[PDB]
Amino acid sequence: MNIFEMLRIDEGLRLKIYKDTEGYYTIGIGHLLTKSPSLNAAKSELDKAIGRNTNGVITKDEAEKMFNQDVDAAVRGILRNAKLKPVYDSLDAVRRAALINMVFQMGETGVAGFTNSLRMLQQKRWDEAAVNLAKSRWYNQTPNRAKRVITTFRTGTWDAYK
Ligand SMILES: [Cl-]
Ligand SMILES: [Cl-]
Numbered sequence: 001m002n003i004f005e006m007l008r009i010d011e012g013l014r015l016k017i018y019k020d021t022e023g024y025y026t027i028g029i030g031h032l033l034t035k036s037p038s039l040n041a042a043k044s045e046l047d048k049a050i051g052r053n054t055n056g057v058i059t060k061d062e063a064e065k066m067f068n069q070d071v072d073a074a075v076r077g078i079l080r081n082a083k084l085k086p087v088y089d090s091l092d093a094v095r096r097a098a099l100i101n102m103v104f105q106m107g108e109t110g111v112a113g114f115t116n117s118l119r120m121l122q123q124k125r126w127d128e129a130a131v132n133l134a135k136s137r138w139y140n141q142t143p144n145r146a147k148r149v150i151t152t153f154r155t156g157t158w159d160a161y162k
Helices: 003-011 039-050 060-080 084-090 093-112 115-122 126-134 137-141 143-155
Strands: 014-019 025-028 031-034
Touching (some): 003 093, 014 039, 025 039, 025 060, 031 039, 031 060, 060 084, 084 093, 084 115, 093 115, 115 126, 126 137, 126 143, 137 143
Antiparallel strands (some): 025 031
């Protein structure tokens, strides 16, 4: 299992614009297009992302390609963030993937906001962190996924995704 697979499981794959769980326009593999209510705006950002007139629909290859950039961007965002970097550096390979997932779903900023959990992860207090991470809107709104990510930090294994 790896980061790609993991996220592919949490996000799914859709080749037509759709609304995510927060109601925002997305496409592909969790690729957010815009927070705006406007479908045109969405279609517009999509074309600009893809580099052609898509009329709201893309191919598998195109999705995958965006997915790859988005993963890369997430890592890169982590490495550039003063609060994240150190946590990430302290972690083993599996758990890193867990931090990437959260950043891909919520943004670097959102994540950097879980101060207390981060500290805990840095200290390798698995159970404690898992409990703190659950007291969050994130967990309340997308509980199944949050559960998968949290178990992963808790156990250091891929069991939640097997
Ligand atoms: Cl883009
Ligand atoms: Cl969920």
